[PDB]
Homo-oligomer: A and B are copies of this chain.
Amino acid sequence: HHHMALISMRQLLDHAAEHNYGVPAFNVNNLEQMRAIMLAADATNSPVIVQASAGARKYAGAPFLRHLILAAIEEWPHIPVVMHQDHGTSPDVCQRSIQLGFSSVMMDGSLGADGKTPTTYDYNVDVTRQVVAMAHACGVSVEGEIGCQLLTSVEEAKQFVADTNVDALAIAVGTSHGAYKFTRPPTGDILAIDRIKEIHAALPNTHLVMHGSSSVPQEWLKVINEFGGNIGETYGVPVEQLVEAIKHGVRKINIDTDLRLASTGAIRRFMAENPAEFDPRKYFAKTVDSMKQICIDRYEAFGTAGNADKIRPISLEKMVDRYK
């Protein structure tokens, strides 16, 4: 076989279930971020999810994010790669992602087209169905979201998957985007691992997704603080708890703030340790190194490692036969 095409998310998460592991999802915004992800996936022989933020299209240009993924597939033809559109705010957005060539899209139907306003359950199912139709015609995978309110209930997860049958459901269990996830180390009362168990036990065949799952490594917070940065006491989701969640049906884990912290830490340390250097390539290399280590830490702790060459890709063309 060959990995000159992307694989669907659905295939990759089916593999996660069959072999009891999870896949961390990393955001790509530019060249150095794409290289760190791929170099880590090569080091651990893991399949890859790379996502584009809602604003990644605007920041980088749509041709560039298409062409970064193409370059990655050329340079590491042995790594299966899912290209996933994160946090689509309307069906029309996800359709442009499909036209651009993504193999997986998220229609965040919990929030309105404005991207902030929580929505009626009916609205959620409507735009999520809407996107499901145009994506499954192509073989493209769909992640939807129910819940914003802040805690997902079991019965509505069961009904929402029945009404839309997305390939993956993102659930709310007390995490959020950014570095200020918790004022204290998160305990069972602020990170509801028990609701995951309940939702998994009710839908033992649906792939669950966790947003805002950066651990926020403390040593990087300290490194930033020493070299001119100032980040107050905040905490993320410990890797230990995310490992338990994978044992209970979590297959996709969105991590973004950790890579931002590793990058900002590396530049701050380097720019102070060598104040005469001005070649960006010199500290860009020390962001690839530090981001790559975070991705390696996750691929291994999440069981993603060792699975890249166990996957026989199925084209998005043949994935149409899985839905119709």
Contacts and interface: CB of A to CB of B under 8 A. Distances in A.
Interface of A: 1-5, 29-32, 34-35, 59-64, 66-68, 70-72, 74-75, 77, 91-92, 95-96, 98-99, 101, 133-134, 137-138, 140, 179, 224, 228-231, 260-261, 263-265, 267-268, 271-272, 275-281, 284-285, 287, 313, 316-317, 320, 324
A73 to B, nearest CB: 8
Task: Please indicate which of the listed interface residues A63, A230, A275, A316 has the most CB atoms of chain B within 10 Å of its own CB.
Answer: A63
B229 A284 contact: no
A68 B31 contact: yes
A272 to B, nearest CB: 6
Contacts of A31: 30-31, 60, 64, 68
A98 B224 CA distance: 43
28 contacts: A2-B2, A2-B3, A2-B4, A3-B74, A29-B281, A31-B64, A35-B61, A62-B75, A63-B74, A64-B68, A64-B71, A66-B71, A77-B313, A91-B137, A92-B324, A96-B137, A96-B320, A98-B98, A99-B138, A224-B278, A228-B228, A228-B272, A230-B275, A231-B278, A260-B280, A263-B278, A264-B277, A264-B278
A66 B3 contact: yes
Contacts of A285: 59
Contacts of A63: 3, 70-72, 74-75
A196 B258 CA distance: 53
Contacts of A275: 228-230
Contacts of A2: 1-4, 77
B280 A263 contact: yes
Nearest to A316: B99
Nearest to A266: B280
Given A30-B31, A62-B317, A228-B272, A68 B70 contact: no
Given A137-B92, A281-B29, A281-B59, A231 B276 contact: yes
A77 B3 CA distance: 11
Contacts of A263: 278, 280
A5 B74 CA distance: 8
A316 to B, nearest CB: 8
A145 to B, nearest CB: 20
A66 to B, nearest CB: 7
Contacts of A179: 278
Given A29-B280, A59-B281, A261-B278, 15 more contacts: A1-B2, A2-B2, A3-B74, A4-B4, A29-B281, A30-B284, A31-B64, A62-B317, A92-B137, A95-B134, A96-B137, A229-B275, A229-B278, A260-B279, A267-B280
Task: Please indicate which of the listed interface residues A4, A59, A134 has the most CB atoms of chain B within 10 Å of its own CB.
Answer: A134
Contacts of A264: 271, 277-280
Contact of A276 (B230, B272, B313): B230
B32 A1 contact: no
